[PDB]
Each structure stands twice: as C-alpha cells, then as structure tokens.
C-alpha cells in the first residue's frame, strides 16, 4: 500500500548504459584532462559524476558551466572528430607543467594552445563550413596571462582579442591580465567557451591573441541521455529506475526517495 | 572542517636571531596557506601568501615554505619592530579556518617578581564590597602562579588576574591578582595572604596583612 | 588608496539584532568578494563569513551559521553583516577584509568552484559589545602603601578602578607628571557584567611622607572624572 521508500543502495548497470565519472566530471572529460583519457569517444545513457572528482590540468573557468554540462549530457556521446584548421603563422600544441600527461608537459587533448612563432603573431582568420546534417559543438578558450611580460613573451601583443562568429550568433572575449593565486604552479587562468554551428552555417574565428583554439567538434543533439550527481556505487544488476541514492524498482505507484531520477520512475 | 595547529604558542628570541614558527594542518591543503602579522592593537597584516610568496612592501627577512600538511614561517633576522603574533590561514575548502597563534617575546631577563599586597580601602568597605589586590611587578618569564590564602585556607574561583605587555625597557611582565569579596565575608577573617610561585624565586613569597 | 572603513559597532543588548556596515574606496569593489573576521578580547582570530563577487556564493561558519546573514551592495561598494540573536560570546572586534579573488580566478576542481582565497586588504575593526549592562562611572579606591608594599628602597601604591561599563578608562598619575614605574593593567570582566582594573606605581619609600600621589581616572562613556589621593595608612 505505502509507496516505496527503500533503495538497494547501488545503481544497476542494466538496462541503461551507465558511464561512471570516478575522478572525472563531464567537462574535464570534454576538455581532455590527462587523467580522463579513457573517456574519449565513449557513449552513455546516464553519466554519473562523483564528489571525489578533481581537476589536474590547467586552472580554468567556464562562465556558463551548467548549460555546457547539459548539452554534452543530453547527447550522450563524447565523439570527437578532428578537423584541420589553417593556423598559418602561429605555433601549435602549447604545453604547460600544470597538465602532466605521461610525465610530460602537455595540455587539454581537445584544445590547441596557440602561441607565438618567432616573435610573430598575425591576425588569424579561419573558417569551417559544417557540411553535415547535425549540429557541431566547438569548445574553445581564452588564456589570461599573469603579467604584461607573459602576454608579450607568448603572443607579442599588448592586448589580445578573440571573436568566434557564425551566421546567427557572435562571441567576443577580451583577456584580463592580472595576478591570480597559484594553482599547480600557474598564476594564469583560462576561460572556456563554446559555439553551436547549425547545418549550413559557417564557423568564423578572428583572434589577435590569447586563443585556445579547438581541434574539432562534438556531435550534439537533444537526446534522451542525461547526467546525475551521485556517490552510490555501480552494481551488477538490472533496474528500470535510477536515483542518486541507488536503483529503484518501478512497481509501486510512487516513491519518496529523492526528487531526482532517470527512467520510468514513479513520482517522488 | 580542517584544523590548524600552530606551534609554539609563544617563544622568546633576541634581536638578530633566526626565528622559525610552523603550522600543521589536519589534512592535505596543497599550498593554499597564508601567513599574517598582528601587531599589538592593530589589524592583521598579510606577509606570506600561497605558502611561499611574499607580499609587496614586506622586508626580505620574512619567508615561508611548505606544502601538504607542514608549513614553516621564518624570520632570518628578528627586529624590534617584529614583536607581534603571527597566524596561519588556509583556504583549501570551506570553512576557512585560522591557526591558534604564536606570540613573539624577548628572553634573557629571568628576574623574580616583586610581590606587594593591598588591603581593601576604607572607602570601598563603605560601599559594601572588598577587593584585595596582589601585585607581581617586573618579572620574567610570563608563567606565574598566584594563590590566595584566607586564614591559611587556599582560595579559588573568587579572584581575577591581569597581565601587562612586556616592558619596552627590561622586557618584564607585571601581574595584578584581585581577590573580590563582600565586606561581610571580609570581616569574618583575619589573615589574608598572597603566595607567589615563580621560576626566579627560590621559595614561594607570601605577602599578608591582618584584619 | 585601497582602504576598508567599517562602522555600526556599539553596545547592544543580548538577543537583539545588529547590522554591521563596511564600505571601501580605491579599488574595483564589484571585482572581488569580501570576508568578515572577529577577534575575542585577548583570544585569537576567528573567521566568520564570505561573499563572492556576485553574491551567489556565500558561506557561514558553523559557530555563526543560521544566526548571521551577510549581504553586498556594489552600487555603494558596501559590505554588510546582519547579526541576529546575539549571545555573550559575540563580544569581539569585527574586521572587514578582501577576498583577494579576481572574478576570473575561479579554478575548477571536481565540482567545487574554488573562489575562496586569502585576505590582502584589512579594515580597522569596530568594537561590538553584547551585554545587558548600562553606562556607569567607576568607583575608584586607593591602594595605600604600607610596610607590606615595600621591597628595598621603594614603595608600591595605586588605585583600584572597580565597577564601570563600558570600556575604556584612562589612568594617569599627578596629571601625567608621574610616568616612570606606572603599571595600568588591562581590565577584567567580572561576573557582574562590569569592568575593573588596577593601576599601580612604585615610588621612593622616603617620599611617602612628603610627596602627594593622585591618580586621574577618566571614563568618557559616563562623563565622569575622578581624582583620588593615595596616602599612607
Ligand atoms: C581515480 O584515482 C585513483 C587513485 O588511486 C590512488 O592512486 C595513487 C597513485 O599514486 C596511490 O598513491 C599511493 O599513495 C601512497 C601513500 O598514500 C604511496 O605510498 C604510494 O606509493 C602511492 O603513491 C593511491 O594509493 C591510490 N588510492 C587511493 C588514493 O585511495 C585511481 O585508482 C582510479 O583508477 C582513478 N579513477 C579513474 C581514473 O577513473
Ligand atoms: C575577420 O577578418 C577578415 C580579414 O579579411 C575579414 O574579412 C574582410 O573584412 C573586411 C573588413 O572591412 C570586410 O569589408 C570584408 O568584406 C571581409 N571579407 C573579405 C573577403 O575581404 C572579416 O570580415 C573579419 N570578420 C568579421 C566578422 O568581420
Ligand atoms: C600536435 O599534436 C597532435 C596530437 O595528436 C598531433 O596530431 C599533431 O601532429 C601535433 N602537431 C601539430 C602541428 O598539430
């Protein structure tokens, strides 16, 4: 008679494909944190983030974190298709000590840190057509140096400017030079942004410094997948309903265990 | 909820010596640790941030080091303008917690206190109360034990003491313990004694009166 | 000039609300957060609360959570701290400090936006006193010298400034003419809610019969000046 109030305590890996977060969140796996290299091109129906997760790369920030977290979560895939942009006149594959991959200075595997090339840095203009029948998700960023000498030593430009535009939208970011508290031995930050390119629309980038260029796109779609914050371990069982407190049988008409759920779950 | 332990609670060095105070955190806080200076009566002043870096305008004699759980704070050459209490603060997670504090003092006096006793004045008796004042003048170190005796019986809970800062000349402390009683309870007894236990004293000194 | 000036500190009755104000000039205030820190008399520094740059990130200490609420006014560049249901432990010098947090210095961990950093700019601190006592002038009593207050060639005498409120009191001897050998001790808070201290001075024992010794006690909260002559018994 009374509605269900008990959970098994674990989340069943069936029938829904459950990709677990462990030390990696969806955004760190999206950017390519070295300790998240095992999540490349991996799909899911429900991605579960853990409280023990942590970042171990370059200190960054995402201004609108939630919307970018919900875009990748609803698509249910981290499929990345590399694209060759014409970064003529600049150097690529910038690395840092705060992002160690295989005990070597590295960077976000999905980002290309453009820096100076022989004390020369031209106004980069590149385009990308998007000839497909689906939306593309480009992940780019803007680097915030610590002092004016770092801004000069890396880009040889007194003021940086970055602009990412399409046929519908445009995004302009200005780097803010200043001293940040040291994080993994770095007094600098990076601001991560994104731009959706619809079919038939062209991507455009006019940057005169501090560009964290992308290496490609992700296949985005408003699918059925989602994301959930939970610490309950994943067990070997089947269960049509899933809650942050664990899997739940969907036989009773209601349930009072948590307001968040996924699947054919009776009302909370 | 991260605990910050700071040792020692106080120390005493001369001018020109190397002073080193530390700070131990209850868990790994990486380099998210800061050091402040609080001169007497003023507000805290930031000196070391991110464990290792020195804030602008601060002399080079100051420095910090450490990562994880143990951090150190070092003054290569102590100066008279460095007499203050230094704290350590974290920011690894919420809540942000401070340290206990470490007071800087001066050594090398090691002189015994001068003990005096003051019976309650006749004007205070008229008001209905009675306060016997015991004085420990110019002594070092700070550690001092003052016990009250009313007709040879040890007292407790009915006295209060206050200590001055180190004198700017001889670096000695002064203490004043106040035994508070009503006049009715004061006139019930005859001998009121103040026994003082200090390191510089061979035997405990007891000053007393009658009535 | 980068400064932080605060006000709103005063004597307030227990169980009543108090609003602390802190405004600063000389820097981009809407570009950092702010912190509150109090210091109990003679005790160490206790941290209290934090606001981020946009007021969306706030955190209260567990000893303070629920009781106090912290607010921000960027239009006037002013920081606030509402204090409700004040108990006796809240007697402390409340300081105003800076986040040291650039809006962009928000490095992400797993899911923790790590905006909280140290404090680089401090205020002056307003004295906030919570008690049910009222304004009163102290009762000064002489600590007369005698044979029990003689060490070698000197003699000890003083005055007992007992039962006043609130702090502070200023004590001088002979209108400031006698300064050497004077020890005015920090006041103690007796269980009656009033303050009390003693101010002693060591003088030559050969001048007790001729020299006049007068302590000058002044307590501006009660507008009372007292001059007591300390004479031998
Ligand atoms: C998420 O991270 C998991 C990390 O597991 C930890 O890995 C470290 C690697 O060094 C182990 O550190 C040890 O620490 C000991 C002292 O505490 C040293 O004596 C020892 O030499 C070694 O350095 C640590 O024991 C280990 N376990 C912990 C911290 O409980 C990893 O296991 C997961 O696979 C990873 N999940 C991912 C990547 O999805
Ligand atoms: C990005 O830079 C390119 C550099 O050529 C711009 O291309 C031309 O910009 C001028 C600006 O006055 C226009 O008049 C031309 O029509 C542009 N195209 C060509 C083929 O010359 C481009 O416009 C810049 N991006 C944006 C959004 O303006
Ligand atoms: C940069 O790194 C990528 C990573 O695979 C590699 O493919 C590429 O050849 C490197 N060099 C350039 C110029 O992109």
Author numbering:
A (entry chain A): 41 to 308
B (entry chain C): 1 to 211
C (entry chain B): 1 to 52, 52A, 53 to 82, 82A, 82B, 82C, 83 to 229
Quote the passages of the study that discuss this structure, keeping the authors' original sentences.
We describe a focused, protective antibody response, abundant in memory and serum repertoires, to a conserved region at the influenza virus hemagglutinin (HA) head interface. Known broadly protective antibodies engage sites on the major virion surface protein, influenza virus hemagglutinin (HA). These include the receptor-binding site (RBS) on the “head” of an HA subunit (1–5), sites on the HA “stem”, and a recently identified site at the interface between two heads of an HA trimer.
The six antibodies with other light chains are quite diverse in the ways in which they contact HA. As an ensemble, they represent the products of multiple alternative affinity maturation pathways for head interface engagement. This interaction contributes most of the contacts with HA.
